[PDB]
């Protein structure tokens, strides 16, 4: 029972399902697969940030399928003297072959077989070649699947990614909010958590935490509770049964967290929805046609012989919900959403690291269906002045990757730019972000929806009329409405703290309760609106509306009558 | 029709002309149209004129902004 | 019968034929060769992306020719201890000598003899030197052909490419549509396939697959079908034979497949024909004269003592079919077509990788006769402002063009929307001297373009594409393709909406036909409401002025001859 199983592993349901489909048939029905005569998977390379329980996934698969599991640790193999490591590898593969079907897990593969450049000693190259020889010799070995864990696909010798070798690849990646919740539930099974804790809240608050990080967080909360109990006070269990961790402990652990994957590229289905940004019905329809249709009805496109549009380009005033729209469409199709902010493109430009663009697209290719979002495609263009041409290394690499990505994969590039003019024209050609969608300032309905979405997490007095606030906030971008909501919240918090200080001081001076401000009231929003600013002047919307009017005026040639 | 001068400098040629602006329904001036008309009138069939159009658009936008 | 043969090799019919020509007489008739004083091939070097079946090619050649096949594995040799690797190489060559005529296939040669810089340890250099010595001693060995497999020619030690060592080189490359279809037929032979599947369709879809990828795709489709049937149930044969793979399984595998050669340059005969781009009969004749004649009638050029033109430069509005014309002329002569887009030139420029230009030409040289096409020769000129007119990448292109032997039938075809900013040094004689104007398509050309675009899309007979072309005067090929795609989009949206309405009706009435089986005429009517002329009259004006300026200098027409 203590052995690992699919229940013990969480946060990678999709990848775990992929591994299941890859390895169940060759392992559950070895002789049947041999009789079929079809090539089974031979090398499965799980990669992702460390601490995501890759070895846990391998052990769970082996245990659930009953296949003999052999663990090879990269550091363990390398620690042995020259020649001894080769003997260890040969013995490991031989033992795995003996107890076929079996799984050989080479944990920390990059420790054994890094990039050829990184390897310096002769024995390092020799052991890498020994591993390659064994992988090629798997052909004569029956029902032996080799699984390897490495931080990134480019962290190991490319010779290991050939065919007959670690060809199958799986990106475990950091878990999402739902995955984090699953991990927390898995690691909080034995802990008798108090009723106060809602693991969903922490799962939302634990952004950037790998599975190991969440396990450490749960351990830290347990140790906080145990510290409190010991301070209150071979060991009886009734106290442990009665020992309950509370949201105080979990928040304290959250404070002392140090997530290990804060800088990892987040790939997940966004929680945003169309209701979060009302209106934009035409843009919603266009986004649906571009994303949902090719991913939900490939048959229609095949029947009518069209290639789905590779991407679209949003243009409009800043902070009008371009990111909101991209996330909403990604959520509509339940497609992974990858956002590349303007700082990322600028970092690639300054460091001359445009090659990283390829990685980005690879990531998206690994998460298909996906919605690749470029937050500010014009960031590089702006950084260059706003006396060369429009071409630049980073956008050129983006073009190269966009051209060279198969349309069978449902990766859709949504570009966002506040300056449609300065964007490199080469990106707007057919086969690229051909379509240009104008995201204007929110209208009254969109303003109401934005205000409602912003105030979703705030206790707001029912007296406030968000309809009125949206009504006379004409010309306010989504960012401006968010700022108004945040400032009203700030005023409410300041009033709450001031009232609490007054209450405690009164108790001090009058030793001798109720919440003075349990909700954000109308006066708070009025004071906030006394600080409201229109981040977009009439002239900027003039520019955007006029560009749209130009693109529409030339879109004439109507009046067509076929007969 | 607010008239303000703009100078087209291209191909070593300087041509200063007044742009009429219809700031005030649906007949309002459009920089992306007036600039194209200007370059066509003064530099018809001239390669690399799009950047000149962008320059004219920027200048007209700056002039119109109050 | 499982022994490999030419029947089991697909996607490299040209390269397989070349290898057969190289290695047939030396192996089939070894004693004859030893009798004659003619130098046989010694070292063949198959290079191409991994998983292309190079080892399969060598094994098939050896088996069909009957020669003794000895396989050396690079990783296997390098796995052994110092001295053991050299002993293994010596023993392999000795075995090949003993059982001659023989083929020694060194798989993953770069593993044994990578670039000399990568060889760090002394033992690695010693092994490479030992391999070189074995090659040099490969003279009195009873016609022992040694073939090696590598990724790229530069991935191995240059000393191995000297004469006597590996000298003949074959570029297996990537299978083409026909090649992919051949590979699919080879790998699906045993699998029982339902009539739903049409392998040519997937072969068209499976772009970027190398053949190992195609085998993986076929295995994935078979496993998908087996999984679908698994819940129902050493294994009984009748059920296996009954089991069939449907086109749905192949499409699912396509979706799940990860091609391993999406970066490799595509060398193949394009399927575009002159029909796909009607009209331009004058440009058609010009392209024929430049490309087809020197390859079809070398005798005439020799007799009249003319050097074939090295290349031509297309200039005109964007999206007017310059790429279409280049592909059409390549197809007519059945010559491989290499496309070098503007992003590639800009990548070489930004990264200072202009050396890669040489590689491009080398590749073009390998696939001769070839039509090397540069989609945007002005990309670098535009990126610099549109300083002098010379840049590193275009300079390297000029160097390679000068160094290109005119006997190899490699024809450069530049293309640009900004002929003015093209470096004049490339328009000199012996370079892309001739300039061809590719104007906007005319009515016949527009009709041809529309018909070509609406070839894979079922469209109603009520549509009069002739009238549509007549009304789209001034539209470029890109604009016509946009109109066709918009019409298909409207048709798809109507189909989706009708399907949703029907499903909702069933939901509210649980108690058929295609609502829109064809792209109806109203769909084109609507699409024409989202149709623009991407090339304004000013762009046409500037191109016409450029052409007129070029032609005006071309006076002296009224020449006499007393």
* Concatenated DSSP letters of A80-149: SPTTHHHHHHHHHHHHHHHT-SEEEEEESHHHHS--TTT--SHHHHHHHHHHHHHHHHGGGSSSEEEEEE
Chain A CA closest to residue B60: A543
Tokens (6 digits) for C20: 């057969």
Give the integer Cα–Cα distance in Å for A229 and A223: 10
CB atoms B65 and A547 under 8 Å:
no
CA distance C392 to chain B (A): 23
Question: Phi/psi at A435 (nearest 5 deg)?
Answer: -70, 140
In chain B, what residues touch C541 (CB-CB under 8 Å)? 44-45
Report CB contact under 8 Å: C545, B45: yes
- Please report, for residues B9, C322, C449, C475, C520, the alpha-carbon distance to residue C478 in angstroms, rounded to integers and kept in the order given: 32, 11, 9, 8, 21
How far B47 CA sits from the closest chain C CA (Å)?
6
Q: With contact defined as beta carbons under 8 Å apart, do C476 and C441 qualify?
A: yes
Residue C529 burial (10 A CB sphere; 0-12, 13-18, 19+): middle
Q: Which residues contact A186 (CB under 8 A, 6 or more apart)?
A: A7, A8, A9, A10
B-C contacts at Cβ under 8 angstroms:
23
User: Are A256 and A223 a contacting pair, CB within 8 Å?
Assistant: no
CB within 8 Å: A553 and B31: no
Please give the distance of CA C427 from its chain centroid, rounded to a whole number: 27
String of b and e for A184-208 (b: at least 16 CB within 10 Å)?
A: bebbbeebebeeebebeebbeebeb
Q: Is C333 helix (H, G, I), strand (E, B) or coil?
A: coil
Contact by Cβ (8 Å): C415, C313: yes
- Contact of A481 with A525, CB cutoff 8 Å: no
Which residue in B32, B54, B65 is closest to A546 by CB distance? B32
Whether B32 sits inside 8 A of A547 (CB atoms) is yes
Beta bridge partners of C144: C102
Q: What region does C214 belong to: left with phi over 0, alpha with psi -120 to 50, or beta?
A: alpha
The strand order across the sheet containing A411-417 reads: A336-340, A370-374, A411-417, A311-315, A435-438
Query: Chain A partners of C466 at a C-beta cutoff of 8 Å?
Result: none
Q: Chain C: residue nearest B42 by CA?
A: C538
**Is residue A549 within 8 angstroms of chain B, CB to CB?**
yes
d(CA A336, CA C125): 48
Tokens of C267: 């060398």
Chain A CB contacts of B33 below 8 Å: 550, 553
SS3 track for C240-301: HHHCCECHHHHHHHHHHCCCCCCCCCCCECCCCCHHHCCCCHHHHHHHHHHHHHHHHCHHHH
- Determination approach: cryo-EM
Instruction: For residue C165, give every residue at least 6 positions away whose Cβ sits within 8 Å of its Cβ, in sequence order, or none.
Output: C42, C43, C132, C135, C136, C159
| Element holding A313 (H helix, E strand) | strand A311-315
Give the three-state DSSP class for A323.
Answer: helix
Distance from CA of A429 to the nearest CA of C (A): 9
Verify whether the Cβ–Cβ distance C538 to B40 is below 8 Å: yes
Using a CB–CB cutoff of 8 Å, tell me whether B36 touches chain C: yes
Q: Is B22 on the interface with A (CB under 8 A)?
A: no
Give the nearest partner residue to A388 out of C223, C263, C384, using CB atoms.
Answer: C384
Exposure string for C206-231, b = 16+ CB within 10 A, e = fewer = bbbbbbbbbbbbbbbbbbbbbeeeee
| Calpha distance C496→C492 (Å, rounded) | 6
Backbone angles phi, psi at C449, to 5 degrees: -65, -45
Which residues of A fall within a CB distance of 8 Å from B32? 546-547, 550
Which residues does A200 contact at the CB level (< 8 Å), separation at least 6?
A: A181
SS3 C439: coil
Distance from CA of A169 to the nearest CA of C (A): 10
Residues of C whose CB is below 8 A from B44: 538, 541
Q: Best residue in A160, A306, A365 to probe C by mutation, most C CBs within 10 Å?
A: A306
Chosen for mutation from C54, C79, C215 (greatest number of chain A CBs closer than 10 Å) is C79
* Sign of the C-alpha dihedral computed for residues C26, C29, C33 and C38 taken in this order: negative
DSSP calls for A328-360: HHHHHTT-EEEEE-HHHHHHHHHTT-TTHHHHH
Question: Where are the alpha helices (H) located in C118-211, listed in sequence order?
Answer: 122-136, 177-187, 199-205
CA A328 to chain centre: 15
Q: Enumerate the residues of chain C whose CB falls inside 8 A of the CB of residue B48.
A: 386, 418, 420-421
Chains touching B (3+ CB pairs < 8 Å): A, C
Pairing verdict, β C102-107 and C144-150: parallel
Which residues of chain C have a CB within 8 Å of the CB of A121? 121
Contact A549 B30 (CB under 8 A): yes
- C491 vs A304: CB contact, 8 Å cut-off? yes
Exposed e or buried b for every residue in C310-341, given b needs 16+ CB within 10 A?
A: bbbbbbbbbbbbbbbbbbbbbbbbebbbbbbb
Q: Which residues contact A156 (CB under 8 A, 6 or more apart)?
A: A45, A109, A110, A113, A114, A115, A148, A150, A166
Q: Tell me, in Å, the resolution of the deposited structure.
A: 2.9
Residue A392: Cβ-neighbour burial (10 angstroms; 0-12, 13-18, 19+) = buried
Name the C residues in 375-434 with CB < 8 Å from any B CB: 386, 418, 420-421
Specify the pairing of strand A370-374 against strand C144-150.
unpaired
Chain C residues in contact with A558 by the CB 8 A cut-off are 528-529
Q: What are phi and psi of C99, to 5 degrees?
A: -100, 35
d(CA A180, CA A207) in angstroms, rounded, equals: 8
Task: Say how many Å lie between the first and final Cα of chain C, rounded.
Answer: 78
Nearest to A166 by CA among A193, A136, A186: A136
Distant-in-sequence, close-in-space partners of A349: CB < 8 Å, separation ≥ 6: A380, A383, A392, A393, A394
**Which residues of C does the annotation place in the binding site for ATP?**
50-56, 151, 187, 319-324
Q: Which H or E element spans position C312?
A: strand C311-315
Element (H, E) at A441: none
Rg (CA), chain B: 12
DSSP one-letter code for A277: S
Rounded CA-CA distance C415/C13 in Å is 31
- Strand B13-21 relative to strand B2-10: parallel, antiparallel, unpaired? antiparallel
| Bridge partners, residue B36, by sequence | none
CA A343 to the chain's CA centroid: 18
């Amino acid at each position: 029972l203590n052995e690992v199983g699919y229940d013990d592993i969480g946060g990678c349901r999709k990848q775990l399902a992929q591994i299941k489909e890859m390895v169940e048939l060759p392992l559950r029905h070895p002789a049947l697969f041999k009789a079929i005569g079809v090539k089974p998977p031979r090398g499965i390379l799980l990669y992702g940030p460390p601490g995501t329980g890759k070895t846990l996934i391998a052990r769970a698969v082996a245990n659930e399928t009953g296949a003999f599991f052999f663990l090879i640790n990269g550091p363990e193999i390398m620690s042995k003297l020259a020649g001894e490591s080769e003997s260890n590898l040969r013995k490991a593969f031989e033992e795995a072959e003996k107890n076929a079907p079996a799984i050989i897990f080479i944990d920390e593969l990059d420790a054994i077989a890094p990039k050829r450049e990184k390897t310096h000693g002769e024995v390092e190259r020799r052991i890498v070649s020994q591993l390659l020889t064994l992988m090629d010799g798997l052909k004569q070995r029956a029902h032996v699947i080799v699984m390897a864990a490495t931080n990134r696909p480019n962290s190991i010798d490319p010779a290991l990614r050939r065919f007959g070798r670690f060809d199958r690849e799986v990106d475990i990646g950091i878990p999402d909010a739902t995955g984090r919740l699953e991990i927390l539930q898995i690691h909080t099974k034995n802990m008798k958590l108090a009723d106060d804790v809602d693991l969903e809240q922490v799962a939302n608050e634990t952004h950037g935490h790998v599975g190991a990080d969440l396990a450490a967080l749960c351990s830290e909360a347990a140790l906080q509770a145990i510290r409190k109990k010991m301070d209150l006070i071979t060991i009886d269990a009734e106290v442990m049964n009665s020992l309950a961790v509370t949201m105080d402990d979990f928040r304290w652990a959250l404070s002392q967290s140090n997530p290990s994957a804060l800088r990892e590229t987040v790939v997940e289905v966004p929680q945003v929805t169309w209701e979060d940004i009302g209106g934009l019905e035409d843009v919603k329809r266009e986004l649906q046609e571009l994303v949902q249709y090719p991913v939900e009805h490939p048959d229609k496109f095949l029947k009518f012989g069209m290639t789905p549009s590779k991407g679209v380009l949003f243009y409009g005033p800043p902070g009008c919900g371009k990111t909101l729209l991209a996330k909403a469409i990604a959520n509509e199709c339940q497609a992974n959403f990858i956002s590349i902010k303007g700082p990322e493109l600028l970092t690639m430009w300054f460091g001359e690291s445009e090659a990283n663009v390829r990685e980005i697209f690879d990531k998206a290719r690994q998460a298909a269906p996906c919605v690749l979002f470029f937050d500010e495609l014009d960031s590089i263009a702006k950084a260059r002045g706003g006396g060369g041409g429009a071409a630049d290394r980073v956008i050129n690499q983006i073009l190269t990757e966009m051209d060279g990505m198969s349309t069978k994969k449902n990766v859709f590039i949504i570009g966002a730019t506040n300056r449609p003019d300065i964007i490199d024209p080469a990106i707007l050609r057919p086969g690229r972000l051909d379509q240009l969608i104008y995201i204007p300032l929110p209208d009254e309905k969109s303003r109401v929806a934005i205000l409602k979405a912003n105030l979703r997490k705030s206790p707001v007095a029912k007296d406030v009329d968000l309809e009125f606030l949206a009504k006379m906030t004409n010309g306010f971008s989504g960012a401006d409405l968010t700022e108004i909501c945040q400032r009203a919240c700030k005023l409410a918090i300041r009033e709450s703290i001031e009232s609490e200080i007054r209450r405690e001081r009164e108790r001090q001076t009058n030793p001798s309760e109720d919440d003075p401000v349990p909700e954000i009231r109308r006066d708070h929003f009025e004071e906030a609106m006394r600080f409201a600013r229109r981040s977009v002047s009439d002239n900027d919307i003039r520019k955007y509306e006029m560009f749209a009017q130009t693109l529409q005026q030339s879109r004439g040639f109507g009046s067509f009558r076929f007969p | 029709p607010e008239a303000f001068p703009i100078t087209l400098e291209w191909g070593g040629r300087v041509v200063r002309e007044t742009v009429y602006w219809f700031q005030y329904s649906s007949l309002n001036s459009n920089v992306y149209d007036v600039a194209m008309k200007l370059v066509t009138k003064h530099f018809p069939g001239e390669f690399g004129s799009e950047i000149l159009v962008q320059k004219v658009v920027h200048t007209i936008l700056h002039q119109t902004a109050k």
